[PDB]
Symmetry: C3
């Protein structure tokens, strides 16, 4: 899975090791191994969420198979909100998530695509 997190918290207010802890958290939530989790954190951005520039975070989750239905994503969302509110010290009103299904032909790995691996 691919997780991308944008935040207007400065880099020195994002807890050290967050990108590693989000790999473990995603592994348990999504049912994929931690060594197949990719995390990108982009701090220090200028953001408005719901029209307000108070501290906030946007998460994007992309994966094959597991983020493609309302029922699956409801479960995922509840667990990611619990993790992120506690780690970033944000309220639930200051986080949004977007889910994007991928297919094997879209993922380039080791000079090929996943369709052939």
């Amino acid at each position: 899975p691919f997780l991308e997190l944008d935040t207007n918290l400065p880099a020195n207010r994002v807890p050290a090791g967050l990108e590693k802890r989000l790999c473990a958290a995603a592994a348990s939530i999504l049912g994929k191994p931690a060594d197949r989790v990719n995390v990108t954190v982009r701090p220090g951005l200028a953001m408005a969420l719901s029209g307000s520039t108070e501290p906030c975070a946007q998460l994007s989750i992309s994966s094959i198979g597991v983020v493609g239905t309302a029922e699956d994503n409801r479960s995922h969302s509840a667990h990611f909100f619990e993790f992120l509110t506690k780690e970033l010290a944000l309220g639930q009103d200051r986080i949004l998530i977007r889910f994007f299904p991928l297919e094997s032909w879209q993922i380039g790995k080791i000079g090929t695509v996943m369709t052939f691996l």
Copy 2:
């Protein structure tokens, strides 16, 4: 709606308050309330647009229902180009926009997804 703006203008050349003014502008253009507009600005990046590293900006707009047809997006594009050329002091050759339709099952909000709200 979700607006993401990447630019190679340094942070100290992006006008103060842009993320707030882009919420108001998007509200009028897209016909959604400003308190449902989310803006992310990422300045200071290394960019080429049309093969040239002169100052430029890329905007991504994602929303339910309103960015899914050529005719709607033609209107949207004209209004966003007018706003951004004036705010960033860029020519129309130095801005591109991408539009992405979303569905309710893809948006995680308050620990659930929008399908159930």
Copy 3:
């Protein structure tokens, strides 16, 4: 085409001119002119790839027509991996690529969309 590269290499470890060389490389690989190539590089990020925070890079490629099949993307992937491993001095285990087809109605250019140009 649109290329976006996220990396945890600091800005002062990304080779000068990379965004320009990636335009030329993409032109040859994708068969589109260099003056229609758009590159965004975001360095200095916090990243884990395959669960590891060692230096890494994520590339996203979006285009009309040419990134929509496994067979096309296998070829593209091999050539992008050769370019990026040499430029960034990374091993092939430290790069992933995502491919995203676009349609003409999604691209805002000169105040309209590409459907009408």
